[PDB]
Structure formats: C-alpha cells, structure tokens
Amino acid sequence: RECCLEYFKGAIPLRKLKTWYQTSEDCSRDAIVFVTVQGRAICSDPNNKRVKNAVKYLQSL
Amino acid sequence: RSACPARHLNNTNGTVLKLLGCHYFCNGTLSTAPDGYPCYNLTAQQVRTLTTYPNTSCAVGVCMKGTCVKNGTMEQCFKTP
C-alpha cells in the first residue's frame, strides 16, 4: 500500500492525534504513521522512544 | 511537509515496494526521495498504460540526486489501487 521515505524529526502533536498504524513490511523503511484530527499522516521512526511513548499515550485512551 | 507516506508501485516478485520516479507529493508539495531509495524508471508510454494489473516490465533503479538510475534489472510493476 503506502511507504514512508523520511521520518518527521520534530515533536509529535499528541493532542491532535486520532490514530496510528504501521507501514507494510514490504516498505524499504520501517515506520509508524500517526494520523491527526485534520487528516495529516506523519511518518515516524519506530525506534525513537518519543514515538513509542506517543503510541502508548494514544492507545491507552 | 515531506514526512508523509507516499504512493508506491507494487510488484509480483515479492521484493521491496518501489517509487515511481524519485519524487512524491506530501500536503500538495513535491519532495525528493532520498539517495539510494528504490524506484522504477518508466517510459512515458508505460506511465500512461500502467494499471492495477501486471502488464508492464518496469526498469528498476536507485534514486540519485532525484533521478531513477537503472540497475539493469526489470520486474513487473503495477499500481496499488
């Protein structure tokens, strides 16, 4: 389906987050994509502890 | 805005998904694939006749300074729907 070419190097918009998902294993890069309220998808490095904590925060709601 | 997921082309031989060319849109702006990223170098006609069915032999390449540099390899590619 879709793959990430670059990681968002900045702060993640926790309170604007709607959901998250994982890109396919067939992508060249591993990625966690965040989807915001207003529809923006943001590629994120799955090894970044900030990214992991964002996913943990979002899934725990 | 360049850290968004991008539409790629699918293949039949079980290998890594690859970009059409070396550029992609995010938020309405065009960004460049990173150097070394896997890509397809299609002719104009191939882009025009690309479908969601395998029907086309696509030249594989690596992105270098925004160009899809062919590595001599060919594989069937087609649009993810």
**Do residues A9 and A24 lie in contact, with contact meaning Cβ atoms separated by under 8 Å?**
no
Question: Which token pair is B15?
Answer: 């290998």
CA quadruple A15, A18, A44, B32: dihedral, nearest 10: -110
Q: Give how many domains chain A has, as a whole number.
A: 1
User: CB B7 to CB A27 under 8 A?
Assistant: no
Q: Measure CB to CB from residue A3 to each of B15, B17, B31 and give the nearest one.
A: B17
Q: Is there a contact between A33 and A6 (Cβ–Cβ < 8 Å)? A: no
* Parent domain of A22: 1-61
Question: Is residue A33 classed exposed, middle or buried when 0-12, 13-18 and 19+ CB atoms within 10 A define those classes?
Answer: buried
Token pair belonging to A1: 């389906």
How far off is chain A from B43, nearest CA to CA, in Å?
Answer: 22
Instruction: Describe chain B by its helix, strand, coil percentages, rounded to 5.
Output: 5, 50, 40
Instruction: Please tell me what resolution, in angstroms, this structure has.
Output: 2.1
CA dist., res. A6 & res. A4, Å (int): 6
- For A7, residues 6+ apart whose C-beta sits below 8 A from its C-beta are A31, A43, A44, A45, A48, B3
Q: What is the least distance, in Å, from the CA of B53 to any CA of chain A?
A: 15
- Closest Cβ–Cβ partner in B6, B15, B27 for A5: B6
Q: Does B16 touch chain A (CB under 8 A)?
A: yes
Instruction: For residue A13, count CB atoms less than 10 angstroms from its CB and return exposed for 0-12, middle for 13-18, buried for 19 or more.
Output: middle
Q: Where are the domains of chain B?
A: 1-81
Q: Distance from B68 to chain A by nearest Cα, in Å?
A: 15
